[PDB]
């Protein structure tokens, strides 16, 4: 099994590098197809390449399929997108506190298909090993400061990305009394994402919305009574968890049911939780000059 995970990760990295070179060529091939249909004259370096024309005659059709959106990009999520229900386990750090364990339970209840695991004495490579051995889609690690959580680590499996984020303004479910709160409904939640516009924003949108099981698309625009909101300002994604009734065709009553975060991501690594030496995709550039001026996501 382990040889298959290593081999498939190496094949994925090689295919991504080949896609970089092929994109450098296919930016030139899309000018030849647009000039053929519209008749505007093109560059001589493009029109006088015999290899480009000879291979263009075979590779028209994938460019047309990408224009129509009929195919999907080579990704770690596009293999099993809406086919499998992504199972995900939430774990603490090594010796958790009682409020960290209740918070772990609360963000377990945020996902309708998640499970929680007691860490105890569990070495982190064997944690990764057991996740790949039970075909989990995601793990989420939690770190507390003193009864208040300060970091999440959302890792996609078998070889997918980590998003490590630091938590702020955490208001737990376990602070309000049982007369006012209650047992959270476990229905498949709607999701809304607000303010993600860069390709890095669509990356974090993908690795956050593939944590939830896929919604049945027959009548999802009106059915379902539970929503989860990820909205970012100043690249600190703030998340709420509401439950709603549609009290009229023009009005809706919301009710806050879950914990509130404003998590800020500081590391997105193309590689799982065990790989400390995985190649990072983005990291929070503090101690640079304009790293506080520039806004990502």
């Amino acid at each position: 099994m382990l040889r298959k995970q290593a081999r498939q990760r190496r094949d994925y990295l090689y295919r991504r590098a080949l896609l970089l070179r092929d994109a450098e060529i296919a930016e030139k091939r899309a000018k030849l197809r647009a000039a053929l249909a519209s008749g505007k004259p093109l560059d001589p370096k493009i029109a006088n390449d015999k290899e480009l024309r000879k291979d263009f005659d075979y590779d028209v059709s994938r460019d047309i399929a990408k224009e129509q959106g009929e195919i999907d990009i080579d990704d770690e999520y596009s293999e099993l997108s809406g086919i499998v229900d992504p199972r995900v386990l939430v774990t603490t750090s090594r010796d958790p506190s009682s409020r960290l364990m209740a918070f772990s339970k609360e963000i377990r209840l945020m996902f309708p298909t998640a499970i929680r695991l007691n860490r105890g004495n569990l070495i982190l490579p064997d944690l990764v090993m057991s996740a790949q051995r039970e075909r989990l889609s995601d793990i989420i690690l939690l770190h507390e400061h003193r009864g208040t959580p300060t970091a999440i680590t959302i890792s996609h499996f078998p070889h997918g990305p980590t998003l490590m984020a630091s938590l702020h303004n955490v208001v737990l479910r376990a602070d309000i009394p049982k007369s006012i709160k209650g047992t959270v409904s476990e229905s498949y939640p709607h999701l809304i994402f607000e303010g993600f516009r860069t390709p890095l924003g669509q990356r974090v949108v993908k690795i956050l919305k593939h944590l939830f099981p896929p919604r049945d698309p027959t009548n999802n625009a009106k059915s379902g009574n539970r929503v989860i909101t990820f909205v970012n300002q100043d690249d600190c994604i703030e998340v709420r968890h509401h439950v709603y009734v549609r009290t009229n065709y023009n009005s809706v009553e919301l009710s806050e049911v879950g914990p509130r975060f404003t998590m800020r991501p500081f590391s997105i690594t193309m590689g799982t939780l065990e790989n400390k030496d995985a190649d990072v995709e983005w990291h929070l550039s503090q101690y640079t000059r304009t790293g506080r001026k520039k806004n990502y996501f």
């Binding site: 099994m1 382990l2 099993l80 086919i83 499998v84 051995r133 039970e134 075909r135």
Partner: protein, 839 residues
């Protein structure tokens, strides 16, 4: 149980390379299957296999025109003649060359044989079956004449009707006429003039016209008329006419001389038969896609028998009715798996040809061939009910057939595309689990729903063997992560207890009383675990017991060949006391599960045309260019479709090219019979059914000194103590004596005998009355026996249920035969008669 297994019939292949034969009565069809000869009785649906076995494949069959003696020639000319009424091996005798023609004389005293250029006419040996005071001689065959007046291969030999002359058809384009003794107006003349060599030269009825059919598709008549200048006559040619089969050469023709009709089978599989002396095409049709190799005709003349060698493809054709009598097909690939039916009357096997087929154990014919899979079929399984069959295959689909309507009511696939290599099904018939080599999850669907229940997971490698427990509570998976899993699915908690092993798991089997499980690993060891408290209770290290090898293309000694030292498949007995184990090797082991010893080892094949059947190859076959069975000899073939090598480089699992010269010996599946007393194993030669030998072996149960057959019949006829006589007969254990006393006691004293019968002899008695219901025509007598037995010993059998399960199963199928065969007809008749009487 008694582990005394002789070899009963071969099954699962209907024809291989060789000559076909009919009985002189016309009913039995003698066909060669590898190195054995099956007899298919066609008037009553039956079949058997002669107890001999040649070292190589059969080349020729001949049969004495009285009917009694069969003479079978292997390759390299080793001949075995045998008595067909008393199926016993009589003489072994080696013609030193490869026999390429053979024909017995219709008088019965001689037989002629063509070894490549030679033509030897031999006497038929005097036999102990025919003489009163006679015995086996040493060298019984006496040669009469030898003729080497010939230049190439003798392809055919045909006697006359008065058995004084015969014709030899050749490969040097010339048929010749020979005599037995020196006649008065005869010279051994030649018949020249052809283009591609004669297929067959035949006499007429009144032996004046003789016909020659050649390979190019031309048949010529030969008469003894005068030369065109007119004592002075010459065997010359009166007319010639041609089969116009367009792009093919005829491979085998036959000629019925009493009814004057000629049949010819061609290279493109379309045969044609012609009323010869005016040559009117009676008809023609395509029986096979590949070719037709051997044609024979009935002695009556109303049936034809064709055999194609590249597939199984044996078929008998009744030409005036224009219909098949049988059209049978053996597997032309490796038989991947097999299971018995829970009745035990029919077995079903699944090969890598893509087809599965249901053979009947009696009569040896396949009764239905399901052909919906588009790739090689792996494991097939039944439920407890026995009406539904679930088959997995490499095209990604676990199909589910209903055998009372013969259509796949379900087909299951995984959403990501897998290729399932093993499967199990709950005995309730409602849950299917299946596992593949591409993904390490193990899939579970529902039969009555159709959609995927779950993907169980926890394996770090591909899952190789699945087994649902026969009570229905526990799935067990076994996988190449050196591990097994006790999956509990049906409980509210779905749990998985691992069994850590030493190497990759190859097979998993349950005990029938489900407390025990045997898992066979890649070291070659069997480990018997308990399922309640998951601890190994027993173990056999079985490398040496199965290691028999040294294939061609194997540069190790047979003792050092690893790969034929493991058990790929294991099955418990229906008793639960003996495993049976078979791998990629020549030996089948039969272990005891309590005393942990090997009770009996079997050898699947003596056939030296297969590759791994002797562990010490001889140095005569090693030239200076490798072994002699390794040089590519396709270029020395007369036909282009035989010369072409459409093979793919490096294709272990099947290709349609399939050179397949000297295939390996491997037992890919074994199964015990649910009625007991038999098992069978899918080898590469066929499907060997072994069974207990109780009628040819004295074996008393617990005998005294004053108990003889004479004393048993004395206390029967004189004393009339029926219980004492029956207990003495079951104690002697001689089936003729038991049958004699069983029929002799009366049907009013059945109840007294059963009421005072012993419970140690109750299960043997139940098995005996089940066999007597299924065989003897004393149906109401045996049903009174069964009724009295179950009414008296009712609570004992229901209390035990595990010691007597096979006896209850065979009694149940005996009354199922009587419930489906006679009483449906009786009820339908009385309702039809009531309606017709009520107008």
């Amino acid at each position: 149980m008694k582990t005394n297994f002789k070899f009963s019939n071969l099954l699962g292949t209907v024809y291989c390379r060789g000559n076909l034969l009919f009985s002189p009565d016309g009913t039995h069809l003698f066909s060669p299957v590898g190195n054995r000869v099956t007899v298919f009785n066609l008037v009553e649906n039956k079949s058997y296999t002669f107890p001999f076995a040649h070292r190589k494949n059969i080349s020729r069959i001949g049969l004495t025109p009285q009917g009694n003696l069969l003479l079978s020639i292997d390759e390299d000319g080793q001949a075995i003649l045998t008595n067909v009424p008393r199926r016993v091996v009589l003489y072994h005798f080696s013609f030193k060359s490869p026999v390429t023609a053979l024909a017995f004389s219709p008088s019965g005293r001689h037989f002629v044989v063509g070894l490549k250029r030679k033509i030897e006419v031999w006497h038929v040996p005097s036999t102990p079956d025919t003489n009163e005071d006679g015995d086996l001689e040493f060298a019984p065959f006496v040669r009469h004449h030898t003729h080497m007046q010939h230049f190439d291969d003798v392809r055919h030999l045909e006697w006359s009707s008065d058995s004084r002359f015969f014709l030899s058809a050749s490969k040097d384009l010339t048929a010749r006429i020979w005599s037995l003794d020196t006649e008065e107006g005869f010279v051994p003349t030649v018949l020249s003039g052809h283009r591609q060599g004669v297929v067959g030269a035949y006499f007429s009825k009144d032996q004046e016209t003789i016909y020659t059919v050649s390979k190019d598709g031309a048949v010529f008549e030969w008469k003894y008329v005068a030369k065109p200048g007119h004592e002075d006559m010459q065997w010359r040619i009166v007319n010639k006419h041609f089969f116009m089969q367009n792009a093919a050469t005829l491979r085998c023709a036959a000629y019925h001389a009493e009814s004057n009709l000629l049949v010819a089978g061609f290279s493109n599989g379309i045969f044609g038969l012609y009323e010869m002396p005016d040559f009117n095409l009676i008809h023609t049709l395509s029986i096979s896609q590949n070719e037709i190799d051997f044609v024979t005709i009935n002695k009556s003349g109303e049936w034809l028998a064709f055999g194609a060698s590249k597939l199984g493809q044996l078929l008998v054709w009744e030409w005036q009715s224009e219909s098949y009598i049988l059209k049978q097909q053996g597997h032309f690939d490796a038989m991947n798996s097999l299971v018995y039916s829970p009745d035990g009357q029919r077995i079903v096997t699944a090969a890598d040809d893509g087809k599965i087929k249901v053979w009947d154990v009696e009569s040896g014919f396949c009764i239905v061939t399901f052909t919906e899979h588009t790739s090689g079929v792996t494991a097939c399984e039944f439920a407890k009910k026995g009406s539904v069959l679930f088959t997995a295959s490499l095209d990604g689909s676990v199909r589910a057939w209903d055998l009372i309507r013969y259509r796949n009511f379900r087909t299951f696939t995984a959403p990501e595309r897998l290729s399932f290599t093993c499967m199990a099904v709950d005995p309730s018939g409602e849950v299917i689990a299946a596992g593949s080599i591409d993904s390490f999850d193990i899939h579970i669907w529902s039969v009555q729903t159709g959609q995927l229940l779950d993907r169980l997971s926890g394996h770090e490698g591909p899952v190789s063997s699945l087994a649902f427990a026969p009570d229905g509570s526990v799935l067990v998976s076994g996988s190449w992560d050196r591990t097994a899993r006790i999956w509990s699915i049906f409980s509210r908690t779905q749990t998985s207890e691992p069994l850590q092993l030493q190497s990759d798991v190859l097979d998993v089997a349950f005990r029938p009383d489900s407390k025990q499980i045997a898992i066979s690993t890649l070291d070659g060891q069997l480990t018997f675990w308990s399922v309640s408290e998951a601890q190994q209770v027993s173990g056999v290290d079985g490398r040496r017991d199965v290691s028999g090898g040294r294939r061609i293309t194997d540069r190790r000694t047979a003792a050092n060949v690893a790969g034929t030292k493991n058990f790929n498949t294991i099955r418990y007995s229906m008793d639960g006391t003996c495993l049976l184990a078979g791998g990629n090797s020549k030996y089948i082991c039969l272990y005891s599960t309590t005393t942990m010893v090997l009770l009996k080892k079997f050898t699947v094949s003596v056939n030296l045309s297969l590759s791994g059947t002797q562990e010490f190859l001889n140095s005569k076959l090693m030239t200076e260019a490798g072994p002699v069975g390794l040089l590519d000899d396709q270029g020395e073939a007369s036909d282009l479709e035989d010369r072409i090598d459409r093979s793919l480089p490096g294709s272990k699992r099947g290709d349609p090219g399939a050179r397949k010269k000297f295939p390996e010996v491997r037992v890919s599946g074994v199964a015990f019979s649910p009625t007991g007393n038999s098992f069978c194993a899918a080898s590469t030669e066929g499907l060997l059914v072994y069974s207990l030998d109780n009628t040819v072996q004295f074996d008393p149960f617990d005998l005294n000194m004053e108990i003889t057959p004479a004393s048993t019949l004395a206390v029967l006829e004189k004393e009339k103590d029926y219980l004492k006589a029956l207990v003495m007969a079951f104690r002697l254990n001689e089936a003729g004596l038991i049958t004699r006393v069983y029929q002799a006691i009366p049907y009013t004293d059945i109840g007294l005998v059963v009421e005072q019968f012993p419970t140690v002899y109750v299960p043997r008695l139940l098995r005996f009355v089940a066999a007597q219901t299924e065989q003897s025509p004393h149906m109401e007598f045996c049903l009174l026996w069964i009724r009295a037995l179950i009414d008296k010993h009712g609570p004992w059998l229901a209390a035990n249920r595990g010691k007597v399960d096979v006896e209850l199963r065979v009694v149940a199928r005996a009354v199922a035969k009587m419930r489906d065969e006679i009483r449906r007809l009786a009820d339908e008749n009385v309702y039809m008669v009531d309606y017709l009487l009520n107008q």
